Amino acid sequence: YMKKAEARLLEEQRRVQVYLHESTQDELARKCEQVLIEKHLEIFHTEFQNLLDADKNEDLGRMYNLVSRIQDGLGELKKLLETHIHNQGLAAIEKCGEAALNDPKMYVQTVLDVHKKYNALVMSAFNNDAGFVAALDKACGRFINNNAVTKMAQSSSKSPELLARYCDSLLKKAELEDTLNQVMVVFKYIEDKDVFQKFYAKMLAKRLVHQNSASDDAEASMISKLKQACGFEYTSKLQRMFQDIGVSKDLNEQFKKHLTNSEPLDLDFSIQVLSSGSWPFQQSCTFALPSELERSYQRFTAFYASRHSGRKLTWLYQLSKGELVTNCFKNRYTLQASTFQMAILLQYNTEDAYTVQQLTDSTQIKMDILAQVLQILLKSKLLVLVELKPDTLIKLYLGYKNKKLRVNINVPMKTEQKQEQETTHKNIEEDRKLLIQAAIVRIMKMRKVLKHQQLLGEVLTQLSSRFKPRVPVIKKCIDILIEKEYLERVDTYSYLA
Amino acid sequence: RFEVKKWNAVALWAWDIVVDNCAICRNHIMDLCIECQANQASATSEECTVAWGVCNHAFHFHCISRWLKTRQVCPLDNREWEFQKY
Amino acid sequence: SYHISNLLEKMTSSDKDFRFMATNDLMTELQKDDDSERKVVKMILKLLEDKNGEVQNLAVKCLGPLVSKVKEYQVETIVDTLCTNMLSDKEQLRDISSIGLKTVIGELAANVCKKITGRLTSAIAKQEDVSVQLEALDIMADMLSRQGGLLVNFHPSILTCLLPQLTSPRLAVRKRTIIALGHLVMSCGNIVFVDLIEHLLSELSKNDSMSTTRTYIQCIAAISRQAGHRIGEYLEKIIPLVVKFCNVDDDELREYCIQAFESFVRRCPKEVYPHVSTIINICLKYLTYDPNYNYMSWKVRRAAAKCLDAVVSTRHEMLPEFYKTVSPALISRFKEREENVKADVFHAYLSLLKQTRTPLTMLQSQVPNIVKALHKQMKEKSVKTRQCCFNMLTELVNVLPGALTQHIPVLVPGIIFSLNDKSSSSNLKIDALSCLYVILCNHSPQVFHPHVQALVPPVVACVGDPFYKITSEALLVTQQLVKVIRPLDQPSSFDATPYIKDLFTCTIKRLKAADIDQEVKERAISCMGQIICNLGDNLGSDLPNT
Ligand SMILES: [Zn+2]
Ligand SMILES: [Zn+2]
Ligand SMILES: [Zn+2]
């Protein structure tokens, strides 16, 4: 029927131009458009949904062309499209199941596919109209922030976390640029961007320290894109890490050149010296450094004392890794392990059995971490004697090997990832309160007397870029500044200098 | 027996002019503030955390917050103070 | 007048909050005097170098609204100072000024572009420093992308400096130069395009190094993607050279030239007609290229598979040749060890089938081979591989309604296995049920009579899954199964008594729930209506209550 109406409309123009007067063109066109389109709008609206369900782009294009001739006739189609896109996004996310909660790639790719399909549909069929792209943007913003995955996590901050975890998987060890651009497209619709930024910084730190980046060009591309996406403070905060790594490379080279003057180190030694303030890492637990490693510790401490007298070092033993070679096995094989595993593996060389409670005193490792790393050791099948018993004796399993020449026994701990996520989520919440307090202080500094609603509006418009503050937390911040004597009440507040 | 071939270590550097203590108040950096200790436990005591700066100088958050009401200069350090970590 | 002066005074308050709020207030005022304009412009430039970061961010964002209101002459010296700041020795100033220039170009008349390009052209040529090259290339690409047609007089000047950069040791310079070249070709004169194409051909003819030929092949692909129709007249010389390059041993070089063929096949259809046979032959010959394993080079296989899809999806008038020569190869290559290549070959064959909507008899002749391959492919552990087979069957049945008449005994157990497998996910189950529904709808009822005993239990189990999406498809399949077990329009000797209670009991629970979603209710009503209509006589006391 749309084809028939489109043909009839052109026939009418031909007729009126050929053998009528030119003053009838407006009236004939209006009457024909009325009788052919405006009287069947309910049928057109019903057919729109069915054409959306079974993808038929040409039919949708013809419907858009026909209904665009009626004044205020495109309004219902926009609402229908918005509802359809929102439902499609929610359904697509829901079919993934519980796996999307721990698989960033699937979760991000589903959203990317849903966005791409309807973006192409809008660009092709609807002639890239502003009203339709507005509906697409609203629908995407709705279903990205709230969906089934966020309900399971009981928070709307899980989506930025999953996006940041997908970026890290992409950038770890031609087409990558396109998917990075798609990720930046998705990042536009996120309400809580500080959650994304903190996680991205925390994973870039791990990538830089452990030297497990794919290529530096991809890192530069991400920095450049985040420059246009985010502001300038975040970019400088990230650049400080690169500057520290660059400085540490030169310092390590200078130490390596200078080491040959004295007796050479029996083992290969590389160091990464980082500024405490810039990097997110925390202080290490108490530890008894192994005797085999004391010389390198003392030599570097003395050297760095001479290079810079003012500064003092603070070693991190939960991020240091090395290589080990064994001759007690059936065949000599080299293995890679962390410093803690080295300490609780170099503890015995000829001794076969040790008690966990007895071995604890020598290494001085805390019991909580010690047990958890013993599960990692036992699962490696390289050690043998599922809850722990302090009186258990552990004995080496001789005559055990693996198919590969080398084995990597540096496996992430079972609970460490969950604890890291929880701690980061708590730090984000604390930082939000600190930023709100700072914003209130600045507003009171600029304006001596202000009202409650005006203050709330100013805080909301100042912090809207990063996150959307809740009203109760702003009032709580006002109360906490009341106790701190920054401002005092006179519904109206005044700065007390 | 086992032997070690390669070891990669990570370390962090900070100013040693401090004794691992705040400069504004002579308490150990992990402990609470003088105002926090003298006063009773409240919501203010819950928000006591060490704060760093671009100059890599570490003080209590409350101490530097009190100090910055009148001045805008780091205590041990004549450059302007900016926040970078909590 | 007086109001702006107070802000200008507070921007030097030596306090962070006062500077921040003064800049914010000025930005707000601009969004909503000759002497005052100069002071504001100088202060924003001075704040670009402030110690604090938030003040710097506000100063950068202020440059946008500032240029629109202030007179044109001031914009000239703003551009001058920013371009000078790019070449400054200080590292942070270059970064902070680059964003400023990008914002100024974004919020933008013809004179400022000419002022910018003069510095940019000299900045790109600096071979000693690479960071300036990278940022200058980015800025020039942004400038050409938006409002780039105005600089008609500077196109040869821009091209004279870009072509040397394609031999740079840094691979990022080449990648950022290709984008600028494409944006230049997007809107330019006819004389410059001829020079660019001639230079690329001359460089390719005298291949200096392996890394150089890759770069020019990528440049040809990119220019074909953007320019499109304009390069069609020059394909007669492009194709033979690339075909000769395709035989080089380098694995990487093959992928780029296959992608180059794909761009010519897709972007410009008219001029590529003679060489379609050569492109198809090359893609077929390299589709089976595994020089290591017999029954690091999966990229070339993927490229060949994608180029075949590009060829098939466009040329409608080549179906007799398609089913003659490309169809047997794709079916034979359903056994790819890598999943990524297998997905590509499945997508290509699906594109062929969608195009097929005489071809029909040739497809019906090839159906047995497709069934033979899919029978082996439906036993795989991976969910993704199994998921493509059902989309294969659905499209095949849709194109040919009675295609699978002779292969129901071998196709039913494959569906049954995926229906009740524990490792299967929701998407696989939904696709299997959808395929079963389409198979049942488009075949004679007498075929499925032996297999009803096998089909009923898994479907009944699927009606009771906690996830409602599976339940909806299960009810839809149950409706057609009810129509199949006892048709009312034709005579049947089949006995349907044992399954009546099995279907009724599972349907009635969903009918009377009062807590399920809309779709499940709307499908339960429809399924129960069909049950009553076809097999209501055998139901006992349940019908009056229902
Ligand atoms: Zn203190
Ligand atoms: Zn305190
Ligand atoms: Zn300081």
Side-chain angles (χ1 to χ4, degrees), chain A residues 1-255 258 260-262 264 267-281 284-291 293 296-298 300-311 313-328 331 334-349 351-355 360 362-363 365 370-375 377-378 380 382-386 388 390 392 396 399 406-407 409-413 415 417-419 421-447 449-450 452-453 455-457 459-467 469-474 476-482 486-487 489-490 492-495 497, chain B residues 2 4 7-16 21-29 33-34 36-38 41-43 45 48-78 80-81 83-86, chain C residues 1 3-8 10-16 18-31 33-36 40-50 52-70 73-75 77-89 92-94 96-106 108-110 112-113 116-125 128-145 148-174 176-185 188-197 199-202 204-205 207 209 211-232 234 238-243 245-249 251 253-266 268-270 272-281 283-295 297-316 318-320 322-323 325-335 337-338 340-343 345-353 355-356 358-371 373-375 377-380 382-383 385-394 396-420 423-445 447-464 466-488 491-500 502-514 516 518 520-521 523-546:
Chain A
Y1 170 75
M2 295 164 193
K3 273 155 159 164
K4 179 83 153 175
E6 215 169 340
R8 292 304 214 182
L9 272 159
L10 294 174
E11 301 203 35
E12 288 305 324
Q13 320 198 0
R14 176 216 155 185
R15 168 169 308 122
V16 65
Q17 199 176 309
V18 165
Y19 58 69
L20 284 192
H21 200 248
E22 65 183 1
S23 77
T24 306
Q25 292 181 356
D26 194 2
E27 294 293 328
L28 192 58
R30 269 183 191 266
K31 298 293 183 182
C32 287
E33 288 180 12
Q34 204 165 36
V35 297
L36 285 159
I37 316 173
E38 195 170 20
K39 184 178 184 293
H40 304 291
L41 284 179
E42 65 281 353
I43 301 299
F44 279 17
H45 295 166
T46 302
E47 188 75 349
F48 197 66
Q49 183 78 43
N50 288 13
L51 292 177
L52 275 181
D53 282 9
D55 298 330
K56 295 181 184 293
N57 286 41
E58 304 62 23
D59 296 17
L60 287 170
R62 275 196 292 272
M63 185 180 288
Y64 166 77
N65 272 309
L66 282 188
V67 188
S68 64
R69 282 170 218 237
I70 301 299
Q71 183 66 41
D72 196 343
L74 274 192
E76 263 305 313
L77 301 194
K78 303 184 177 139
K79 193 190 62 63
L80 289 172
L81 185 74
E82 170 175 346
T83 292
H84 183 61
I85 295 171
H86 180 46
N87 287 119
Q88 288 297 302
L90 280 179
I93 288 165
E94 187 167 23
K95 300 192 168 147
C96 278
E98 293 179 353
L101 194 71
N102 296 115
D103 196 319
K105 197 188 71 47
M106 170 195 309
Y107 175 81
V108 175
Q109 278 299 335
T110 306
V111 167
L112 283 175
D113 291 331
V114 175
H115 171 96
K116 181 174 72 68
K117 188 193 174 182
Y118 284 94
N119 186 252
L121 179 50
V122 170
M123 182 179 72
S124 69
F126 303 123
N127 177 242
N128 203 359
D129 197 343
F132 287 85
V133 305
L136 174 60
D137 294 9
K138 298 188 269 288
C140 292
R142 286 229 283 289
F143 76 88
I144 293 190
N145 299 305
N146 294 76
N147 46 44
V149 159
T150 65
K151 298 291 180 68
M152 303 156 86
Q154 290 202 346
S155 180
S156 186
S157 299
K158 194 90 193 173
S159 180
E161 165 175 354
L162 290 163
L163 208 55
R165 292 173 64 190
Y166 181 46
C167 282
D168 167 87
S169 312
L170 275 177
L171 289 172
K172 246 176 169 170
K173 269 195 225 155
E175 176 190 47
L176 176 69
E177 301 293 329
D178 190 359
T179 198
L180 290 183
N181 279 280
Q182 309 288 33
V183 170
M184 295 298 102
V185 172
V186 164
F187 171 86
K188 183 175 67 209
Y189 304 117
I190 285 173
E191 278 184 344
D192 291 331
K193 315 197 175 187
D194 55 353
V195 170
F196 175 88
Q197 298 179 343
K198 181 84 60 150
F199 272 99
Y200 187 74
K202 176 158 307 283
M203 301 193 167
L204 182 58
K206 300 288 184 68
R207 267 186 269 140
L208 281 165
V209 169
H210 294 332
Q211 315 264 9
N212 63 7
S213 295
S215 66
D216 291 331
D217 291 330
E219 292 291 344
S221 179
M222 294 299 291
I223 296 299
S224 167
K225 296 185 212 284
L226 284 152
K227 261 183 184 141
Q228 295 297 109
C230 297
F232 181 68
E233 174 68 27
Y234 186 55
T235 288
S236 294
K237 186 180 289 293
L238 283 179
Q239 283 296 341
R240 291 177 176 120
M241 303 189 162
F242 283 111
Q243 184 178 2
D244 288 330
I245 295 297
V247 167
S248 182
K249 291 181 181 180
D250 276 350
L251 183 63
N252 177 90
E253 205 74 46
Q254 184 178 2
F255 180 75
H258 178 270
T260 67
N261 294 115
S262 61
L267 58 86
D268 291 331
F269 188 101
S270 278
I271 193 66
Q272 301 262 341
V273 172
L274 319 166
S275 65
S276 168
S278 297
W279 296 69
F281 305 127
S284 178
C285 64
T286 181
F287 194 51
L289 188 153
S291 177
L293 279 65
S296 296
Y297 182 76
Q298 296 296 109
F300 195 88
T301 316
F303 170 80
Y304 195 76
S306 86
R307 296 294 86 193
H308 304 93
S309 54
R311 325 176 152 176
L313 276 190
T314 312
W315 295 66
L316 305 193
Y317 299 123
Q318 70 275 17
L319 305 169
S320 66
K321 66 181 183 179
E323 278 169 349
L324 273 188
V325 59
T326 186
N327 56 5
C328 186
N331 46 2
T334 175
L335 72 164
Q336 310 174 13
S338 77
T339 298
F340 289 165
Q341 293 175 333
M342 293 177 70
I344 61 180
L345 188 138
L346 294 174
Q347 184 61 74
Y348 45 75
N349 47 5
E351 297 84 2
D352 203 24
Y354 269 98
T355 312
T360 306
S362 66
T363 69
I365 293 171
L370 183 63
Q372 184 177 2
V373 65
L374 271 294
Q375 275 78 15
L377 292 155
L378 294 174
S380 79
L382 188 153
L383 282 183
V384 67
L385 278 70
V386 187
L388 189 61
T392 301
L396 185 138
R406 52 220 301 153
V407 59
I409 62 170
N410 193 358
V411 174
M413 293 180 183
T415 300
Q417 187 68 255
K418 187 174 183 291
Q419 296 294 321
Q421 291 172 8
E422 293 179 353
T423 51
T424 303
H425 272 298
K426 204 157 47 179
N427 296 115
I428 296 164
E429 294 293 328
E430 293 179 353
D431 273 24
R432 301 189 156 170
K433 294 181 176 67
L434 286 167
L435 294 174
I436 288 172
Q437 291 185 21
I440 281 164
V441 170
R442 303 201 293 255
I443 298 168
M444 294 298 102
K445 252 174 203 192
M446 186 66 204
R447 298 173 175 88
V449 159
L450 215 61
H452 197 81
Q453 191 63 256
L455 183 62
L456 265 66
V459 174
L460 261 67
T461 187
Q462 270 178 234
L463 299 176
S464 85
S465 179
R466 284 185 271 309
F467 67 101
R470 277 179 303 173
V471 167
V473 74
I474 297 183
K476 177 178 302 301
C477 284
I478 297 169
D479 285 278
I480 193 66
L481 278 70
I482 288 296
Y486 275 82
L487 62 93
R489 198 181 294 97
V490 298
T492 300
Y493 314 81
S494 76
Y495 193 8
Chain B
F2 311 95
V4 60
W7 188 50
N8 293 317
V10 181
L12 262 57
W13 67 265
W15 294 124
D16 196 25
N21 60 337
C22 184
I24 307 170
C25 71
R26 271 72 177 175
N27 298 115
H28 178 258
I29 190 167
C33 292
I34 59 170
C36 314
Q37 213 167 26
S42 284
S45 184
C48 201
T49 310
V50 180
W52 313 77
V54 175
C55 63
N56 211 16
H57 277 124
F59 318 108
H60 298 111
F61 181 58
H62 296 131
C63 300
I64 190 75
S65 181
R66 277 183 285 162
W67 172 278
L68 283 176
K69 287 178 69 67
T70 67
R71 290 134 291 192
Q72 294 82 17
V73 164
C74 177
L76 283 72
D77 173 10
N78 293 332
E80 192 161 337
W81 168 275
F83 275 104
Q84 71 172 353
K85 195 168 156 205
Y86 304 111
Chain C
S1 61
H3 182 71
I4 301 299
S5 168
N6 177 44
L7 294 178
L8 294 174
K10 293 182 183 293
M11 290 202 252
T12 60
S13 296
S14 177
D15 187 29
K16 166 205 211 293
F18 272 135
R19 295 206 288 287
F20 187 95
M21 275 300 213
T23 309
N24 196 337
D25 279 20
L26 197 151
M27 180 178 44
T28 300
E29 294 294 328
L30 266 292
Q31 272 162 294
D33 193 0
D34 193 1
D35 193 11
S36 294
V40 172
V41 167
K42 184 178 184 293
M43 294 299 291
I44 289 170
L45 268 53
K46 211 184 177 179
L47 286 174
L48 280 177
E49 323 200 347
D50 198 353
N52 191 13
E54 293 179 353
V55 193
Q56 286 175 291
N57 202 5
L58 294 174
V60 173
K61 294 181 176 67
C62 286
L63 293 174
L66 183 63
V67 300
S68 79
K69 299 298 293 295
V70 180
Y73 160 78
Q74 185 64 255
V75 185
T77 186
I78 287 161
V79 165
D80 192 348
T81 188
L82 285 179
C83 290
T84 300
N85 267 358
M86 293 177 70
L87 282 72
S88 180
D89 188 22
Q92 184 178 2
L93 294 175
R94 318 183 304 103
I96 193 66
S97 277
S98 298
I99 307 185
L101 293 174
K102 292 181 181 180
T103 57
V104 166
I105 292 169
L108 183 63
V112 301
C113 285
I116 290 180
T117 187
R119 276 79 172 270
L120 291 197
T121 305
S122 166
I124 299 181
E128 69 275 16
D129 188 5
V130 61
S131 313
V132 191
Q133 293 179 356
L134 296 163
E135 182 65 26
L137 275 152
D138 214 325
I139 293 188
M140 182 179 72
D142 208 300
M143 180 175 45
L144 294 174
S145 178
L150 277 296
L151 292 176
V152 290
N153 291 319
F154 295 85
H155 292 297
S157 77
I158 297 169
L159 186 150
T160 44
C161 77
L162 283 190
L163 299 197
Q165 306 317 312
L166 279 169
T167 194
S168 296
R170 274 299 279 293
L171 276 296
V173 170
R174 295 177 197 180
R176 282 192 178 184
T177 298
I178 300 194
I179 301 169
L181 272 164
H183 278 120
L184 169 59
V185 183
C188 67
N190 270 321
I191 193 66
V192 64
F193 180 78
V194 176
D195 202 17
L196 181 57
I197 298 291
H199 183 255
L200 263 67
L201 293 151
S202 296
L204 284 176
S205 297
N207 72 104
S209 175
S211 163
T212 298
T213 300
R214 306 184 178 144
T215 305
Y216 291 108
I217 278 175
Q218 295 189 250
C219 199
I220 281 179
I223 190 167
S224 197
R225 180 134 49 245
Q226 291 256 22
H229 62 87
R230 294 183 69 187
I231 196 167
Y234 292 73
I238 293 178
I239 299 297
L241 183 63
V242 175
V243 176
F245 269 113
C246 188
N247 284 318
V248 176
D249 187 29
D251 266 12
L253 180 57
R254 269 190 191 84
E255 152 191 353
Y256 300 112
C257 65
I258 295 183
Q259 297 185 19
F261 291 166
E262 185 210 342
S263 66
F264 310 140
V265 183
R266 187 178 295 276
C268 54
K270 298 291 180 68
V272 65
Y273 182 76
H275 325 276
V276 178
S277 64
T278 304
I279 291 160
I280 288 174
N281 189 359
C283 295
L284 262 70
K285 170 193 168 263
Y286 290 134
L287 186 58
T288 52
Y289 173 68
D290 206 310
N292 184 284
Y293 182 76
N294 62 350
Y295 296 120
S297 77
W298 54 272
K299 306 198 156 97
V300 62
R301 271 188 268 146
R302 254 176 64 101
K306 290 184 184 294
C307 186
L308 274 181
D309 176 339
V311 165
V312 174
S313 182
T314 300
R315 312 329 281 261
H316 178 29
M318 293 177 71
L319 288 174
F322 281 158
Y323 285 97
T325 197
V326 66
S327 190
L330 289 175
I331 300 158
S332 66
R333 297 300 300 172
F334 278 167
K335 59 183 183 294
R337 52 183 293 165
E338 189 96 359
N340 284 315
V341 171
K342 193 186 289 182
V345 307
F346 271 87
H347 197 62
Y349 207 83
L350 261 68
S351 179
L352 181 45
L353 274 168
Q355 183 66 41
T356 318
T358 44
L360 297 169
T361 178
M362 294 182 286
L363 182 58
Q364 204 158 3
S365 166
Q366 305 254 323
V367 169
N369 270 338
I370 310 175
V371 182
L374 286 177
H375 163 57
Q377 287 300 322
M378 293 180 183
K379 293 187 286 185
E380 294 294 328
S382 66
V383 176
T385 299
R386 278 188 287 186
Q387 190 168 347
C388 301
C389 303
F390 298 131
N391 292 117
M392 186 66 204
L393 288 190
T394 296
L396 178 54
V397 171
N398 282 325
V399 173
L400 270 184
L404 308 187
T405 293
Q406 296 294 321
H407 316 277
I408 295 299
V410 300
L411 291 184
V412 163
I415 294 173
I416 301 299
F417 177 78
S418 297
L419 273 175
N420 54 11
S423 84
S424 296
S425 62
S426 309
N427 289 113
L428 182 57
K429 293 209 189 80
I430 293 175
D431 291 331
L433 288 165
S434 284
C435 176
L436 186 55
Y437 176 69
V438 160
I439 290 179
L440 294 170
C441 288
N442 297 336
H443 280 86
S444 69
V447 179
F448 307 88
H449 277 157
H451 314 122
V452 169
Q453 195 184 2
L455 285 157
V456 164
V459 168
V460 167
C462 275
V463 192
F467 193 33
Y468 68 91
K469 286 290 199 293
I470 312 184
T471 292
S472 312
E473 294 293 328
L475 288 176
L476 183 63
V477 169
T478 299
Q479 199 167 341
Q480 202 59 38
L481 198 63
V482 161
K483 294 181 176 67
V484 165
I485 65 182
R486 186 177 155 160
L488 272 191
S492 294
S493 182
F494 187 67
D495 188 309
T497 307
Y499 320 127
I500 301 299
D502 291 331
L503 289 180
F504 174 84
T505 313
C506 67
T507 307
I508 204 67
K509 294 181 176 67
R510 293 299 183 202
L511 185 43
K512 65 182 181 180
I516 62 170
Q518 198 179 2
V520 189
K521 270 170 191 296
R523 305 255 196 157
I525 291 149
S526 297
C527 176
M528 187 66 204
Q530 189 82 46
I531 277 173
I532 283 176
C533 170
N534 296 115
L535 61 83
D537 58 354
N538 288 317
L539 307 173
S541 44
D542 290 331
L543 186 83
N545 194 32
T546 291

